[PDB]
XYZ file of C-alpha atoms in Angstrom:
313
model
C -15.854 47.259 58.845
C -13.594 47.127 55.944
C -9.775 46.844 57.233
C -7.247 47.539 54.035
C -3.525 47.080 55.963
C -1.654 50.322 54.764
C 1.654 47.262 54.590
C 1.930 44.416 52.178
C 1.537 41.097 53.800
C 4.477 39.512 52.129
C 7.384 40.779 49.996
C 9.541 38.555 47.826
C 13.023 39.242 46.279
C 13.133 40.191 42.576
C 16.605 40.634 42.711
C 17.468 41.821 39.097
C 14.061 42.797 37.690
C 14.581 44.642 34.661
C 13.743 48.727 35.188
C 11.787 49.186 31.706
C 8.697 50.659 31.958
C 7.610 48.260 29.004
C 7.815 44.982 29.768
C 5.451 42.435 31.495
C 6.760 40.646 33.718
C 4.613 39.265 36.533
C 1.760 36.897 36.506
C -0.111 34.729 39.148
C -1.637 31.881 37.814
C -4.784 30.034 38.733
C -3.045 27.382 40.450
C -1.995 29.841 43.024
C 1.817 30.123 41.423
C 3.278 33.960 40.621
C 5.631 33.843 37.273
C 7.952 36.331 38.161
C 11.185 37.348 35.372
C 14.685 38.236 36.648
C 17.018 39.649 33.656
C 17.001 35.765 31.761
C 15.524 34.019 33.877
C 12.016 32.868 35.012
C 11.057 31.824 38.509
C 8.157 30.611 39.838
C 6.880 30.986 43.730
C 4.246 28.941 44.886
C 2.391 31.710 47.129
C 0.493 28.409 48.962
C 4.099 26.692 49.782
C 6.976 29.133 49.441
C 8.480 26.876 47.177
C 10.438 27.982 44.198
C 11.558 27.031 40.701
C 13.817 28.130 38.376
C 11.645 27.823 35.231
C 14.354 28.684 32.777
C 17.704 30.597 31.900
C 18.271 31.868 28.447
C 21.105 30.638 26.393
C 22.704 33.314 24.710
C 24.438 36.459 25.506
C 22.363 39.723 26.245
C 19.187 37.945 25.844
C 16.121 38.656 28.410
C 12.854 37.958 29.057
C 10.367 40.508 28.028
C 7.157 39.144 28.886
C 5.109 36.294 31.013
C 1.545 35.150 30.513
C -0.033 32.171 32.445
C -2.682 29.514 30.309
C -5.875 30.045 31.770
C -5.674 26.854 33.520
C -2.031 27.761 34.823
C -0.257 24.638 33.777
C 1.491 26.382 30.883
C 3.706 29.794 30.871
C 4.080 32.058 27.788
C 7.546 33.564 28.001
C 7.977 36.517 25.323
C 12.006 37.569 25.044
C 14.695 40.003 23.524
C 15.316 37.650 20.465
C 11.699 38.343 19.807
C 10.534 34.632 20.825
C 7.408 33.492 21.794
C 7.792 30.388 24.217
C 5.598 28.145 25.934
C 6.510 26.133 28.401
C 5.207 23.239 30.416
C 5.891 24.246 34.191
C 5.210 21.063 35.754
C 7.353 19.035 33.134
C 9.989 21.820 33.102
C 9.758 21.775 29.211
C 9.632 23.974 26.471
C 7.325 22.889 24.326
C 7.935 25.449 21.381
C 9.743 28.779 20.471
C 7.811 30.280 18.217
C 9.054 32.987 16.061
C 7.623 35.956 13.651
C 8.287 39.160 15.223
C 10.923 41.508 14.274
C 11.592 42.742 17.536
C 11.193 42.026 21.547
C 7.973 40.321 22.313
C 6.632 42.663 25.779
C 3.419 41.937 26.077
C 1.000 38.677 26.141
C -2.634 37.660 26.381
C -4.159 34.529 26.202
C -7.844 33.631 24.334
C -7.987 29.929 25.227
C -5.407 28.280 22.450
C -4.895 31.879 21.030
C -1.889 33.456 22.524
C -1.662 36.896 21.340
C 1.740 39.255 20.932
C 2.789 42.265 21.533
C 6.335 43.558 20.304
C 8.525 46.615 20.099
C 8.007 46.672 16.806
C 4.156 47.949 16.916
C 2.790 44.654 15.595
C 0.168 42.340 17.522
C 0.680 38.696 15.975
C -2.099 36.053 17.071
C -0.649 32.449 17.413
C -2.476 29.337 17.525
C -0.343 27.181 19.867
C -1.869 23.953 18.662
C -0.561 24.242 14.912
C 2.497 23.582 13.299
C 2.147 27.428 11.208
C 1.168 29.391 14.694
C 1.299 32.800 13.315
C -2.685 33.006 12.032
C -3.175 36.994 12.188
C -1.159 40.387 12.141
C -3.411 43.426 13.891
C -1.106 46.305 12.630
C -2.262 49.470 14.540
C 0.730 50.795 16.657
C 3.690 52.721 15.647
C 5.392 52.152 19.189
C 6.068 49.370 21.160
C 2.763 47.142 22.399
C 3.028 47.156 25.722
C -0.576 46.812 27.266
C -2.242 43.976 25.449
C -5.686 42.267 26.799
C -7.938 40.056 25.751
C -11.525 40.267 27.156
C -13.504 37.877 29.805
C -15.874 37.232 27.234
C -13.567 36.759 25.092
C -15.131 39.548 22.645
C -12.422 42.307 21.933
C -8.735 42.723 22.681
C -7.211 45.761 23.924
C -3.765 46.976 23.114
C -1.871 50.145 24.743
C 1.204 51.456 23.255
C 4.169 53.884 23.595
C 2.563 55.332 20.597
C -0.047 57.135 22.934
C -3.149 55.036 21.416
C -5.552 52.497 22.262
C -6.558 50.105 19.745
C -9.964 47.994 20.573
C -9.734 45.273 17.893
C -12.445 42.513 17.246
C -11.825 38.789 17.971
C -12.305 37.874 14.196
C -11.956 39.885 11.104
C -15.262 41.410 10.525
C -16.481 43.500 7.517
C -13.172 45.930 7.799
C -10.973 43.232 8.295
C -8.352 43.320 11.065
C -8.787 46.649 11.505
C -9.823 48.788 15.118
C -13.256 48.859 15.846
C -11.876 51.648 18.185
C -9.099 53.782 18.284
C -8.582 56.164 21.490
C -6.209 59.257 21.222
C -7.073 61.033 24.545
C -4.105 59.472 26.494
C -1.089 61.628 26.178
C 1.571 59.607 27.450
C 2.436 55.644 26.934
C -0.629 53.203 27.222
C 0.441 50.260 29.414
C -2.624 50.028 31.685
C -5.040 47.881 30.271
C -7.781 46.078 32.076
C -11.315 45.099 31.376
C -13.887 45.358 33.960
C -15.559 41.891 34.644
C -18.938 42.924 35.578
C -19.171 44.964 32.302
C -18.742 43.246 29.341
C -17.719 46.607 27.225
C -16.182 48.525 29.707
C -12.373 49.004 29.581
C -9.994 50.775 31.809
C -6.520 52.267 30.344
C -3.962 54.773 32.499
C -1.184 56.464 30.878
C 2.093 57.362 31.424
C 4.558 59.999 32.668
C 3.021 62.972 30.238
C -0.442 61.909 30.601
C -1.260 60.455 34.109
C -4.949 59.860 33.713
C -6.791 56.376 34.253
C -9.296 56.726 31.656
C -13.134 53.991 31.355
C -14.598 53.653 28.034
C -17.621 52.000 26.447
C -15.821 50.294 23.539
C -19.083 49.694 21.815
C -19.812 53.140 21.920
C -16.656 54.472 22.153
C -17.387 56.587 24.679
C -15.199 57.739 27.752
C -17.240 57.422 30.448
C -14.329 58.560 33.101
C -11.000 60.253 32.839
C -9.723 60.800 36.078
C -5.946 62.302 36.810
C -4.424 59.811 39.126
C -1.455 62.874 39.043
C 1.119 60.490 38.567
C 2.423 57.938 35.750
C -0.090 54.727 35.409
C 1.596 51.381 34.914
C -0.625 48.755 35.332
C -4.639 48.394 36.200
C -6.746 45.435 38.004
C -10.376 45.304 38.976
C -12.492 43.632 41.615
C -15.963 42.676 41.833
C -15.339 42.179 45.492
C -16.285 45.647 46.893
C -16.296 47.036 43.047
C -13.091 48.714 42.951
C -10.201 49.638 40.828
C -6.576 49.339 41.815
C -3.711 51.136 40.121
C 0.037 51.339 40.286
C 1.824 54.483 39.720
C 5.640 55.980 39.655
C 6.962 59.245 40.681
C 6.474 60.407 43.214
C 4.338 58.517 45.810
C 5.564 55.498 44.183
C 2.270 53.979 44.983
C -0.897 51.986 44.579
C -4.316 53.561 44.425
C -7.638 51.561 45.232
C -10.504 53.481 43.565
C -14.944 52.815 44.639
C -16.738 52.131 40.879
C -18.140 53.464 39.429
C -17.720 56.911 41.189
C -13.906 56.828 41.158
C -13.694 58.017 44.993
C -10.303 56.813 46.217
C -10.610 54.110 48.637
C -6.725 54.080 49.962
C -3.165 54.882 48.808
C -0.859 51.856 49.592
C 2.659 53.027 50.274
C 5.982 51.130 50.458
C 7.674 50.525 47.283
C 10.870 53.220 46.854
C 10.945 53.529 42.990
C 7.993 52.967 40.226
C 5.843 50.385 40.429
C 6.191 48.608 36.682
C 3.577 45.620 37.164
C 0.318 44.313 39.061
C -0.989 40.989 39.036
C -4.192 39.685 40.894
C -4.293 36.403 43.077
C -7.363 34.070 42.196
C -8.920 33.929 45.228
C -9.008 37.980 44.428
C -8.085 39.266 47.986
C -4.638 39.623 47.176
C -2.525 42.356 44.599
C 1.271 41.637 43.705
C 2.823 44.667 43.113
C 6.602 44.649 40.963
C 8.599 47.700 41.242
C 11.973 48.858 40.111
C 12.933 48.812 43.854
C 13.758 44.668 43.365
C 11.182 43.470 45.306
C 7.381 42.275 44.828
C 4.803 43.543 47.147
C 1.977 41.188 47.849
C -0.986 43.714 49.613
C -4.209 41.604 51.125
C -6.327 44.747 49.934
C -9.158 43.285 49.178
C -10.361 40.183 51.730
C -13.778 39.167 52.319
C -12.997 39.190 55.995
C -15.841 37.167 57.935
């Protein structure tokens, strides 16, 4: 019964998009809006309307935008950038209501944790910033010696994940505990940059990470126990992970050379379908909230929009 369209529904320009494997640069908020960042500037595409705005530009020469990361309630946009800001901005208002500054290097990856916004730069440092407060920079989780560029806060709320170009996964707690703000794990398996990073929302502990170019595995892992419960070689590069409770699937975006996403049956890790169509490596995929739809970016300046997983009646 279950029709997956082998197209993408929609596709929309991203005329621009910056080809670093990297950087974050897609989200789709909860009020139905996808964040998308061209070279300096931000747009925004209502995927209910069609309409468009220009969020922002950046003022000075050479600077981009790094990363985006939507509020949970989608009426705010973290924007991380080259000058190693972290801005938020009011998308309704059009305003930025603070740059906020304490890296050292290119902010490329962002999750939220209710007020917490969390960090991710090139220089290996996660910074936790409480938006709220005047001093935001309240913690420094120091476990990378490459660029963050996976970071991911749990549902629950209970651990974050990072992924790095340093070939590790750090599982950190949500507080400082009895070791401080130190990893309560530390995976090493992954031989190639960690920038898939996505926790399963039926499992509380269960966390899925792919790697890169010289590693090509999406691997599962208990992060209580530590174990991995699933390595499985997707035989190509693994940007970017989602999950779905509808059927109970995993989708996955890879580079050369297929170019394509893979939609994986959990907890068996049978592929489901192969979803063709972008011409260079997918960077970036971003779920919509009514779950039936995947945005895929990809170096080939456009975003993908596949209705792979509808609860048709």
């Amino acid at each position: 019964c279950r029709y997956i369209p082998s197209l993408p529904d929609r596709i929309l320009d991203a005329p621009e998009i910056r080809n670093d494997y990297y950087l974050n640069l897609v989200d789709w908020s909860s009020g139905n809006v996808l964040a998308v960042a061209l070279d300096n500037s931000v747009y925004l595409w209502s995927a209910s309307s069609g309409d468009i705005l220009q969020l922002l530009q950046m003022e000075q020469p050479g600077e981009y935008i790094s990363s985006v990361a939507w509020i949970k309630e989608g009426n705010y946009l973290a924007v991380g950038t080259s000058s190693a800001e972290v801005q938020l901005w009011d998308v309704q208002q059009q305003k930025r209501l603070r740059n906020m500054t304490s890296h050292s290097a290119r902010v490329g990856s962002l999750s939220w944790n209710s007020y917490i916004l969390s960090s991710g730069s090139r220089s290996g440092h996660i910074h936790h910033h409480d938006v709220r407060v005047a001093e935001h920079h309240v913690a420094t989780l120091s476990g990378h010696s490459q660029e963050v560029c996976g970071l991911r806060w749990a549902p629950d709320g209970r651990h974050l994940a990072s992924g790095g170009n340093d070939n590790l996964v750090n599982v950190w707690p949500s507080a400082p505990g009895e070791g401080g703000w130190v990893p309560l794990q530390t995976f090493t398996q992954h031989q190639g940059a960690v920038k898939a990073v996505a926790w399963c929302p039926w499992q509380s502990n269960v966390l899925a990470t792919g790697g890169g170019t010289s590693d090509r595995h999406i691997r599962i892992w208990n992060v209580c126990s530590g174990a991995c419960l699933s390595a499985v070689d997707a035989h190509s590069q693994v940007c970017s992970i989602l999950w779905s409770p509808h059927y109970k699937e995993l989708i996955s975006g890879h580079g050369f050379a297929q170019n394509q996403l893979v939609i994986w049956k959990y907890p068996t890790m049978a592929k489901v379908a192969e979803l063709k169509g972008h011409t260079s490596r997918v960077l970036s995929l971003t779920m919509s909230p009514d779950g039936a739809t995947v945005a895929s970016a990809a170096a080939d300046e456009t975003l993908r929009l596949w209705r792979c997983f509808e609860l048709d009646p």
